[PDB]
Design a protein around this ligand. Structure first.
Ligand SMILES: Nc1ncnc2c1ncn2[C@@H]1O[C@H](COP(=O)(O)OP(=O)(O)NP(=O)(O)O)[C@@H](O)[C@H]1O
Ligand SMILES: Nc1ncnc2c1ncn2[C@@H]1O[C@H](COP(=O)(O)OP(=O)(O)NP(=O)(O)O)[C@@H](O)[C@H]1O
Ligand SMILES: Nc1ncnc2c1ncn2[C@@H]1O[C@H](COP(=O)(O)OP(=O)(O)NP(=O)(O)O)[C@@H](O)[C@H]1O
Ligand SMILES: [Mg+2]
Ligand SMILES: [Mg+2]
Ligand SMILES: [Mg+2]
Lengths: 372, 47, 372, 47, 372, 47
């Protein structure tokens, strides 16, 4: 065993790289695409499918589809293809001699883990492997052992209360409101201004618009009010075709649905008031340290003003006498992967690996005994 | 005849017991602060 | 005062009906709902809120919410609405001329009784009213006058040792783990199989699954072993969309949390051993009759096999020389209400009412003097 | 040594949860249904 | 053998320190705690158990439990752990070369003393040890030849008359109502206002509330009558989460259960009328000096108003011509330890140690011949 | 000279004596029987 690989199977962005490094070696979208139109040139260098950056760049001709949906593998053939890509093309590594650590969302279907383990031991034949929950890796990347950790990637949001090394499983909360679903709302509200992105290729353009222009507020009502002075809020964007979009309210309407899921018809509370609820499910003495160590992670905590908005909401909900300190390092996007690249390096962690023999003596059921 | 309202004291949300935020998703909890501390909590309104 | 009314406004079902009847007239859920989406259809006459069976049937469009949480009235506007419903629509009775008996859990906040009495006397104008403890009524329902009577409705469990008509208040035990929390724990474990349920109507679907398929294990590890071997323990269920569930382990993992509150994260002991602790707090001579008269009541004592399981637990804890007999009449669900319908009919009880003139002379504070 | 294949249970499409049909336009949803009962859905194929 | 150690193994607070000193070197709760929820952070190095201040500070994640109940060691593994802590971590002294004096409640099971001595001589190798009754140490602390001691720390209340250095064992009275039992009643009565507390850490919070806000009435009915105009007696308390409790009657209702055990359901007479009964069992000529030397000790004699309540009751019971004089030095909490440290340094007491060479010739049965 | 271990007699839990189950929620009560003569109780373990 030379050096552990660490993989965050992002609903939007796969992150892979070796342990001990402080940044992933390769990051690429978790996209598999098939040619939508028929081929007419002969000997063009044809492939029946493209994955990662190839699919992303050639998107004008491909029916891009995501194997991950809300943190769960919905198609295993394309997922095996993505696994093969991230092993053999990006990392340029034979997985037959590298232990591998995978990061998964909590409360996932047990069959997702069991088939993932069966794949990693029976077609990629890793010597050892382990499954860890993304929030705990973010907490390791924070260099911390106590505090609420809120992870909101492209697939789900989930918060996991940790205190002095002990997890509180009964207080875990989970929402499917996340980056991909948030791009769809932007696709809907852009039609208010005439723009009509409908295809899966234009989904990526809407994602780019969201990432480069969207932001959050200190008071959603005040930002809606400033739309009366309809010049300051608006920002322009240039499509690959050269057409120029201008968007106003939409750039903060989309992120705001994180705090008000009612916009997309969901009943549950926002990204706030679920962290607060998870804190209140914790033990009474636990809460003092949770408010002061509210770590964030994930790509959808990257909108400017997320920290201010959530701090204001949590201070509004929580008692006034309690100091509230949200932790937002600049590397939130890769913090799950960095957490794994720390954890897989620990000399104490070497006993936790599910070895090849520990799999082949007990089948894919081994994960529920070894992993959390 | 009528008598003055017996206002319910704000519920203290202990880790387990007679009160919890998540048990009723149709109400939001709000701060009922007096003299610089929240006392307990009250639940009402949307979300 | 021709006929008394009796109401068990528990956390799940509003069991209400006249005195002398052996069964309640209305068992509509204690639920109030508001429309979740905008009413585009002009002239439909849709109401601003629904209560009871109306909200339960149209749950797909409403934000169902319970005014009772763990036996405590949390929203008095919706509770007043539920009172108004159970009086004017279900029973079709004007409450201003019928004395009313209400059943409350023990160790409740006093302000709950105060405001309930104010509501009963000042917006419904009942001529008389009384408050009785839910578990004590299940003794009148069982006819006996000694027993460690135990209630597990939808919101709480409690057990209240009575001997020869005298209560032992210092031995009363209470746990806030019941039908609601069991439903939430069943929602949590249903995600292990991919069956995600997050909305309040899906809680009502998971409550149906809970009531129709769940059962209590006689030996938890043996049922786990026999469930781990693929076998006839697993049952299917059909959703109101026609999609079909199957559940194995989950249908006895859920009720087992009554005996192992560690599963829902509580430190407290189970329904067994708390019933044993209340027997131990009793006097030394009283325990002979308590072991032989362990009366059960309330909705969550209806799981098949609960009596055998608890009997095994109590015979394990108690001395071997003791004969132990759990009493569980098939009418467990309505036994608290049946007890109230006995009590209100007694000639000897008719002096214990809180009369209208007794209320307006001393305020709502009358309850702590007249009632237990 | 290989173990027997472990299989994903057919998904229940709840109004919000583990999957929704519009998230992946590049798969068709297909029904699985036998012995008079339909265990749920799978994501597949083209168009 | 340079300096003896003195330990009061309090049901609530272990008090230990070197002899000769006027204050204990270390005071910490007699608490052993185990982690409740599962650990997830590899390499934090969590211990499998905690004791004393470690358990108290991290109580939010632990299941605190008291090895002592009513002065009796109920779990000897945790008690041995507490011994090892109080020797090697707090006092920072190897006990194998320090004589040790231990304080015990009267009328305790003899096997408790025998196994305590066995622990002292076999696993700690203490060169010499002695057991003295907790109440008799209070007379060395006060510097008196004669008195009726009342001691009540966390486990028991007990009273021992001593006259001119001669005890009166037949007049000793004991009640098991004390601190821990009286904390539980406060937990019960707090539910009247809606402040539920269940877990053991929350019982510690209730203990803090009791110690910081409770007091004893002069006339309980006048405090009850003045509390009806509930503005003056109400006091606020801030929980670690930031909520504020406000308590009225409960702050004097809870200590009054000492003077009226009927509240907690016990038949026995109060803290008063048992001291008086012990005086009645004494000789006729003895009682003059006992009325004037009623010496209070132990933690639950710390309430404001305690001396006034008890003096008023004793004067009401005792003959009018007798001048009742209750003694209550401000060091009530540590008085038992102070007396132990005093007599352990006496030159005459050095003959009364149970020596290692005596124990290895007479065993744990030696204590009943050497000690009172 | 290591003398033999003495055993604490099983606690007889009366109504208000020196023993009660609820005082330490961190221990479960365990019955220590002897051929139907149940003796008393000792406390250990979780729940
Ligand atoms: N700068 C940004 N601003 C706003 N949103 C962003 C930004 N960068 C990424 N995102 C969003 O976050 C997604 C990727 O975040 P990432 O942290 O990689 O989540 P993931 O790991 O792909 N998902 P999961 O496996 O569920 O954690 C994108 O697809 C966008 O929806
Ligand atoms: N057959 C059953 N099997 C299992 N659970 C049941 C069954 N029937 C009802 N329940 C549960 O019992 C609850 C209703 O019981 P019920 O005795 O009416 O409670 P209640 O009186 O409203 N509650 P409360 O008074 O607050 O304790 C339901 O909401 C379910 O959680
Ligand atoms: N200021 C106070 N006011 C009231 N009660 C107090 C106070 N300080 C401590 N207590 C109570 O007193 C107990 C400690 O008294 P203490 O004399 O040290 O008992 P102990 O030595 O632990 N046990 P015991 O062996 O019975 O004497 C605590 O556990 C509380 O119940
Ligand atoms: Mg991810
Ligand atoms: Mg009820
Ligand atoms: Mg003591």
């Amino acid at each position: 065993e030379t050096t552990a690989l660490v993989c965050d199977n992002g609903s939007g962005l796969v992150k892979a790289g070796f342990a001990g490094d402080d940044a992933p070696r390769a990051v690429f979208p978790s996209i598999v695409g098939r040619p939508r139109h028929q081929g007419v040139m002969v000997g063009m260098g044809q492939k029946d499918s493209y994955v990662g950056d190839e699919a992303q760049s050639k998107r004008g001709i491909l029916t891009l589809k995501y194997p991950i949906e809300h943190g769960i593998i919905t198609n295993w053939d394309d997922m095996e293809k993505i696994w093969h890509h991230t092993f053999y093309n990006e990392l340029r590594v034979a997985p037959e001699e590298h232990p591998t650590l995978l990061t998964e969302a909590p409360l996932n279907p047990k069959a997702n883990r069991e088939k993932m383990t069966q794949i990693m031991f029976e077609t990629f034949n890793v010597p050892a492997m382990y499954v860890a929950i993304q929030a705990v890796l973010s907490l390791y990347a924070s260099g911390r052992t106590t505090g609420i950790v809120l992870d909101s990637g492209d697939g789900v949001t989930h918060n996991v209360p940790i205190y002095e090394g002990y997890a509180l499983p009964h207080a875990i909360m989970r929402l499917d409101l996340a980056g991909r679903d948030l791009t769809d709302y932007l696709m809907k509200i852009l039609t208010e201004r005439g723009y009509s992105f409908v295809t899966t290729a234009e989904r990526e353009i809407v994602r780019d618009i969201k990432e480069k222009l969207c932001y959050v507020a200190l008071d959603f009502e005040n930002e809606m009010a400033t739309a009366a002075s309809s010049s300051s809020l608006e920002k322009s964007y240039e499509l690959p075709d050269g057409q120029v979009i201008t968007i106003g309210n939409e750039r903060f309407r989309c992120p705001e649905t994180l705090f008000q899921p009612s916009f997309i018809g969901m009943e549950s509370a926002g990204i706030h008031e679920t962290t607060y609820n998870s804190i209140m499910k914790c033990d009474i003495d636990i809460r003092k340290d949770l408010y002061a160590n509210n770590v964030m992670s994930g790509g959808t905590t990257m909108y400017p003003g997320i920290a201010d908005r959530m701090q204001k909401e949590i201070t509004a909900l929580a008692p006034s006498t309690m100091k509230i300190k949200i932790i937002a390092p600049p590397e939130r996007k890769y913090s799950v992967w960095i957490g794994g690249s720390i954890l897989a390096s620990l000399s104490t962690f070497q006993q936790m690996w599910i070895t090849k023999q520990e799999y082949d003596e007990a089948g894919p059921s081994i994960v529920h005994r070894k992993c959390f | 005849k009528k008598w003055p309202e017996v206002k319910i004291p704000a519920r203290i949300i202990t880790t387990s017991g007679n009160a919890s935020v998540d048990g009723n998703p149709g109400y939001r909890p709000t701060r009922v602060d007096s003299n610089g501390e929240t006392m307990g909590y009250e639940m009402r309104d949307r979300v």
